[PDB]
Design a binder for this molecule. Structure first.
Ligand SMILES: Cc1cccc(Nc2cc(Cl)nc(SCC(=O)O)n2)c1C
Ligand SMILES: Cc1cccc(Nc2cc(Cl)nc(SCC(=O)O)n2)c1C
Length: 267
């Protein structure tokens, strides 16, 4: 029964996310054959990568804009796609589809970015992150090179990811972790907190059992992951504040309407 739950969540994860850790680590390891990632480490390579990966935009003249504005809009596009995937994943979580329609929206509103930065670790190593469906690799140092405030976007997530990747979780662990993130009983605005906590309790229960079987060498792995969930909520809170800064101080860098709605009245 509980392994049913764990397998259903794992299978929904493998099915709904176009990029997962095993596939990411292959690309990140320099392995693979055709269509390897284009490395984006300075202005020259960013322009080259854009001419191949976003041809229509280049024809619209985006390369007249600041590199920081293109990178930010690239980030937004990835976020919209990942929110779409997480929304479908959550539907595959047992019990979620039975919740009130307003509570589903609320759980995903507060959960998506915590889950996003958790799973972002999977496509990060100490030197950069995968982008563009595995076809680009943008270096950590190039991102640090951007003018403020855009140089402050990615680095706190690199810092989180290096410590998160140190736990050596696999997709079977991560799928349960993300399920636990979404089914969070203390989100603001929740109508039926009681059903969500019962849903949360069952998922975390399976997580605890799964980590017991999958990581018998890490005595405190379960409470370490509880702490990472708190760490992610703080990271998202801070991230929403930097995005709000960029929204008002930085013109040319408008916010997408799906993401705008996520941050509205969030924190
Ligand atoms: C790392 C990478 C890969 C592929 C394309 C791009 N540049 C982008 C990507 C996107 Cl989705 N959008 C833009 S500019 C959009 C606009 O100016 O409204 N520029 C970048 C920065
Ligand atoms: C899965 C993935 C990989 C790479 C980038 C992104 N989007 C990000 C990541 C970071 Cl650290 N920052 C941003 S700012 C735009 C937004 O708030 O959605 N967007 C995402 C969501």
């Amino acid at each position: 029964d509980l392994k049913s739950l764990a397998k259903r969540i794992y299978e929904a994860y493998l099915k709904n996310f176009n990029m997962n850790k095993v596939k990411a680590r292959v690309i990140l390891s320099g392995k693979a054959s055709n269509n390897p990632p284009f490395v984006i480490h300075d202005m020259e390579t960013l322009c080259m990568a854009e001419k191949t990966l976003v041809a229509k935009l280049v024809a619209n003249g985006i390369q007249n804009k600041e590199a920081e504005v293109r990178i930010f809009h690239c980030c937004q596009c990835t976020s919209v796609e990942t929110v779409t995937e997480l929304t479908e994943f959550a539907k595959a979580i047992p019990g979620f589809a039975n919740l009130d329609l307003n509570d589903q929206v609320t759980l995903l509103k507060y959960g998506v970015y915590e889950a996003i930065f958790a799973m972002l670790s999977s496509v990060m190593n100490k030197d950069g992150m995968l982008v563009a469906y595995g076809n680009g690799f943008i270096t950590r140092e190039f991102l640090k090179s951007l003018r403020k405030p855009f140089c402050d976007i990615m680095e706190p997530k690199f810092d989180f990811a290096m410590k998160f990747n140190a736990l050596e979780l696999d997709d079977s662990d991560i799928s349960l972790f993300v399920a636990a993130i979404i089914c969070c009983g203390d989100r603001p605005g929740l109508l039926n907190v009681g059903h969500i906590e019962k849903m949360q309790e069952g998922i975390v229960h399976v997580l605890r059992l799964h980590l017991q079987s999958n990581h018998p060498d890490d005595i405190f792995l379960f409470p370490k992951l509880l702490q990472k969930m708190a760490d992610l909520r703080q990271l998202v809170t801070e991230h929403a504040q930097l995005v709000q800064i960029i929204k008002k101080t930085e013109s040319d860098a408008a916010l997408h309407p799906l993401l705008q709605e996520i941050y509205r009245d969030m924190y």
